[PDB]
Every structure is written in structure tokens, then in C-alpha cells.
């Protein structure tokens, strides 16, 4: 139903321990534009694996 | 798949036609009465000059189920009725002399040798 | 509440007359003996009926 005692700030510090967000470090590079696109994701300008596939 | 509070047709010249099961014999807490079992029943509808009467309890063996029976070959023999044959609850022998409708081979036991000999088919 | 029976004669009494257990029990003992007392008179009436017959 509800709490009985007030959990300390120390207890909360352990609850959010696993709440740490993660970095990606999966930064791939383009071959032509050399831009920094994610793995398997197209670039900003629409280049992917050395090909202007987005046509934009 | 026959149990208590189940209406069955009687396939004999006993004098009753509308019967209602009350208990399935055999082991303890059993739930179903297969095509070759014994069950305690009552009588709901009987002919006037019959051999039995309304509200009379005695054992009875079933011979036909709508559920059918699987044979050791994987084939089943479903029917379109729940037929039972009455038995004298103390001596377990049939009280009727004329059996109506087809029966199955599953009655191949000494308690039903006379029954199978009077059926019209199977 | 108490419920004493007299199995040889089957007669039963449910003494809810008083409040406390033992009070009802002995009154039930009083009630059951009272039943046997009266029922003995009816058989005695069965005794006296035939004498006139």
C-alpha cells in the first residue's frame, strides 16, 4: 500500500545505481563524406556505405 | 464423457427411457464414465407396464456416448446418442432382453457377454 | 449451544434455553431425561390400552 518509514537518501543512491545511461561508442565513419554516422544508419546528408542513397 | 446430472436414453426393453446418472463407480473422485463402465443411475421416465418405475435407483452400464471411443489404431467411433443398458444393481446382470441400436466391441468382458449377443450390430 | 442425542432412542435436544454451556448441558440432560420420562408413559399407555381390550 504505502511506505512505513522514510528510506534514506543513501538507499535512493543505490536504487539509481543501475539507472546510469550508457554511451554508444559505435560511431562509424562514412567513406566518401567521412561524416560520423551510426553503425547501419545513413549519414546526415544521406550517404551510406559510399553511396548517395537518400537522393536529397 | 458421461457424468452425474446427465440424461441418457436406455437401449433395452426394461421399461425406462429417460434416465439420469447420479454417480460414476470405479475408483474415488472419478469424473467420467467411458463407454465401457458402470454407473449408478435413477429413472425419470418409464413406460406404464414396465419392469421398473419412475424414481428407482439401480446400476447401469453405458454402451453409447456422443464422445465416442478411440481404438488402438487411432480411429474413433462416435455416436449421436448417450445410450445405456440397465443392470440389476446387486447381481449386475441386464434386466432387459432386447437391446436397441448398435453397440461397440469394447463390451468384450464377461459381465456383458449376454449384452453383445442381443445387440443388432457390432 | 449444546445438542445431546439419545442414540438408542434417537431423541435429540438442542438446549438453547440458558446462556452458559454447562447450564444448557444439564438442562439438556434435564430435557432428554424429560423426553424419556414421557415416552415411557406412552408405551405404558400402550400397556394400559390392551388391558382394556
Amino acid at each position: 500500500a504505502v511506505q512505513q518509514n522514510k528510506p534514506t537518501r543513501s538507499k535512493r543512491g543505490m536504487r539509481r545505481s543501475h539507472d546510469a545511461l550508457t554511451a554508444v561508442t559505435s560511431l562509424s565513419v562514412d567513406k566518401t563524406s567521412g561524416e560520423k554516422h551510426l553503425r547501419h544508419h545513413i549519414t546526415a546528408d544521406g550517404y551510406y556505405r559510399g553511396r548517395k542513397v537518400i537522393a536529397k | 464423457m458421461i457424468q452425474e446430472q446427465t440424461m441418457l436414453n436406455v437401449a433395452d426393453n426394461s421399461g425406462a427411457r429417460r434416465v439420469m446418472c447420479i454417480k460414476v463407480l470405479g475408483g474415488s473422485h472419478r469424473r467420467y464414465a467411458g463407454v465401457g463402465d458402470i454407473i449408478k443411475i435413477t429413472i425419470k421416465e418409464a413406460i406404464p407396464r414396465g419392469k421398473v418405475k419412475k424414481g428407482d435407483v439401480l446400476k447401469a452400464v453405458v454402451v453409447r456416448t456422443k464422445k465416442g471411443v478411440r481404438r488402438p489404431d487411432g480411429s474413433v467411433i462416435r455416436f449421436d446418442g448417450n445410450a445405456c443398458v440397465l443392470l440389476n444393481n446387486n447381481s449386475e446382470q441386464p434386466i432387459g432382453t432386447r437391446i436397441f441400436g448398435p453397440v461397440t466391441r469394447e463390451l468384450r468382458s464377461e459381465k456383458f457377454m449376454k449384452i453383445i449377443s442381443l445387440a443388432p450390430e457390432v | 449451544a449444546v445438542r445431546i442425542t439419545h442414540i438408542p432412542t434417537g431423541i435429540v435436544t438442542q438446549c438453547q434455553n440458558d446462556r452458559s454451556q454447562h447450564k444448557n448441558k444439564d438442562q439438556a440432560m434435564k430435557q432428554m431425561k424429560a423426553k424419556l420420562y414421557e415416552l415411557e408413559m406412552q408405551k405404558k399407555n400402550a400397556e394400559k390400552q390392551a388391558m382394556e381390550d
Binding site: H41, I42, Y48, V53, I54, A55 | - | -
Partner: protein, 120 residues
């Protein structure tokens, strides 16, 4: 359980689901390429591919069926006259999925779906 069960629900009742992909199918062949969510595009491939397969051959029976599905006259004009012929050699696998960036609003993984011909 979903064991060996294919196809996705997509938070929509079937009636809405089949009608959703139907309007999506025509929009694809009209522009050769569109941008949508990854999951929808991953399931769009099981819709347009049989149509293109039905487009590879041309018959009065098929064109009616191609109209039975997709319920459109202008779209079927795109098919059997452009896609059917230009995909005569191609045997299966007519679409291509390119995972673009996430949608800015709900961080939904957007993906680009196009036709493998698209000469330009």
C-alpha cells in the same frame, strides 16, 4: 506465447491494420521512396512484394485482383505499366530498407523504404 507466430499487431485492430497498410502501399509506388517507422517498414515488405509479384505478369484477372487489393486505379496504372516491366528480370526482393535517424518527437526509430530500381 507467440511461438512461431508471424506478423505484427502494431497497436491496431486488424480492420484498421489492413486498411492502414493498404493506403501505405499505394503511397510507396507513387513516390518510389518514403520515410516511416522501422517496424512498419519491416512489415510493409510483406504487403507490396506480392503485388509486385502479381505485377510481374499481366492478366485481366490479375489487374482486377490488383484492384481488389489496394483499391486504386491510378496506382494500378503505376503497376503493370512501369513496375511490372521494369521488374521483369528482378526475382524477389524489390524493396530496400535504410534506417534513418530517430523521429524528433517520440524518438521513434525512423527508416527509409525504397524500391531497388529507382534509376535516379
Amino acid at each position: 506465447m507467440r511461438h512461431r507466430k508471424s506478423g505484427r499487431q502494431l497497436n491496431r485492430n486488424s480492420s484498421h491494420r489492413q486498411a492502414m497498410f493498404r493506403n501505405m502501399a499505394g503511397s510507396l509506388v507513387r513516390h518510389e521512396i518514403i520515410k516511416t517507422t522501422l517496424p512498419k517498414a519491416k512489415e510493409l515488405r510483406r504487403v507490396v512484394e506480392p503485388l509486385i509479384t502479381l505485377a510481374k505478369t499481366d492478366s485481366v484477372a490479375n489487374r482486377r485482383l490488383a484492384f481488389a487489393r489496394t483499391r486504386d486505379n491510378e496506382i494500378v496504372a503505376k503497376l503493370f505499366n512501369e513496375l511490372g516491366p521494369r521488374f521483369a528480370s528482378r526475382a524477389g526482393g524489390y524493396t530496400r530498407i535504410l534506417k534513418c535517424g530517430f523521429r524528433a518527437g517520440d524518438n521513434a526509430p525512423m527508416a527509409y523504404i525504397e524500391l531497388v530500381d529507382r534509376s535516379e
